Structure 1
């Protein structure tokens, strides 16, 4: 279906942004990485596969770690997403947030873990609980303007400081984010997304690419 979905849950949209208030009337918002709600086109080809074994070490090993999650399954829930971040956006106290939306055929309470990882070691984990709302023959879950942690704020600023993009990509090669969305009381896994990043060498802006994770 070329979507980031598992039978239990679907990630409709994902956004990481900075917002600034130019004047009291006007606010400017720049998106670092963006995934939008797109309709599946009949024409579209299947998602390519990446052997999960090959990305194990980019994420912590023991627990909350790909190998273990993937053994727990369900293996249809596991995806990989490659962002090309737009790093061309400033002042003190602009707001840094992450805004996402999910859809389901059921109503649950979902818990969203987000581990920022460096060199496969996790530097921080957020945990968010989100509740179901009903629309369109589906239940949706909205996460509005969730704050960015400061690690990531410092990382983005200092990463933008670097003189050349190829350096940025050198730093990014051991930067990952692992996101696991569970049902809160079940702790059943609904959706796991591994995230890897590259700086957009084009001025084309934010791009992404989705691959299914497999264990042949």
Structure 2
């Protein structure tokens, strides 16, 4: 069906992770490490490929809160895997590091958004954010705007760039994952689960991404 990152209850319209600096009072420069933009589905476009959830359980935390138990509760429709090719080709005291996200739903809800930064399948840090529905045409939208990045990730990015070669970065990135779970805050119902895996863009093509459905046949 749709290549969209969407369950039946919630769609990810946009995601970006960026650094922003002020060159001069009038001028700002903004660099996106990763970017998913709103795109509209195209009839021609092919169905999403599938990846077995069992193959990524190790990459992500386990036991409660883990990918296996979340998939068990469901819904299976809501689980997606996104691979990012990060643009590291961008040094300023006082640059801002932020993550911006947008979501859409048919029904107004108060959503809770958990973001877990993981190393070797284990959680370094978690963020829990509350967001509220805003009316738009034919839909309700939820905007996370300029959420500051955790200090771990800022340090991880600077030292990642210090590495002399991209294959080294890729070797690090193999055990770096992010797992995002969006729930209705009160019901705790799962609306959307995104597992993120990473590779450095080995070209100056810049930020690139690929979406997969997560299946448990």
TM-score normalised by length of structure 2 = 0.99
Question: Could you list the runs of 5+ residues in structure 1 that have no partner in the other structure?
Answer: none
Deviation readout 1:19-59 (Å, 9 max, x if unpaired)? 00000110000000000000000000000000000000000
- Structure 1 residue 129, shift from structure 2 partner: 0.4
Partner of 1:40: 41
**Partner Cα distance (1:150, 1:182) in 2:** 25
**Partner Cα distance (1:120, 1:15) in 2:** 23
Q: Secondary structure at the match of 1:58?
A: coil
Q: Is the 8 A contact 1:6 1:190 kept in 2?
A: yes
- Structure 1 residue 212, shift from structure 2 partner: 0.1
The CA RMSD over aligned residues, in Å, is 0.4
**Partner Cα distance (2:88, 2:34) in 1:** 9
Q: Is the 8 A contact 1:115 1:177 kept in 2?
A: yes
**Partner Cα distance (1:163, 1:72) in 2:** 43
- Structure 1 residue 90, shift from structure 2 partner: 2.2
**Partner Cα distance (1:66, 1:115) in 2:** 12
**Partner Cα distance (1:64, 1:9) in 2:** 20
Deviation readout 1:158-204 (Å, 9 max, x if unpaired)? 00000000000000000000000000000000000000000000110
TM-score normalised by length of structure 1 = 1.00
**Partner Cα distance (1:170, 1:68) in 2:** 28
Deviation readout 1:87-107 (Å, 9 max, x if unpaired)? 000211100000000000000
Q: Is the 8 A contact 1:20 1:90 kept in 2?
A: no
Q: Is the 8 A contact 1:3 1:40 kept in 2?
A: yes
Question: Could you list the runs of 5+ residues in structure 2 that have no partner in the other structure?
Answer: none
Runs of 4 or more, structure 1, over 2 Å off, are none
- Structure 1 residue 63, shift from structure 2 partner: 1.3
Partner of 1:74: 75
Q: Is the 8 A contact 1:49 1:213 kept in 2?
A: yes
- Structure 1 residue 64, shift from structure 2 partner: 1.3
**Partner Cα distance (1:208, 1:63) in 2:** 29
Partner of 1:127: 128
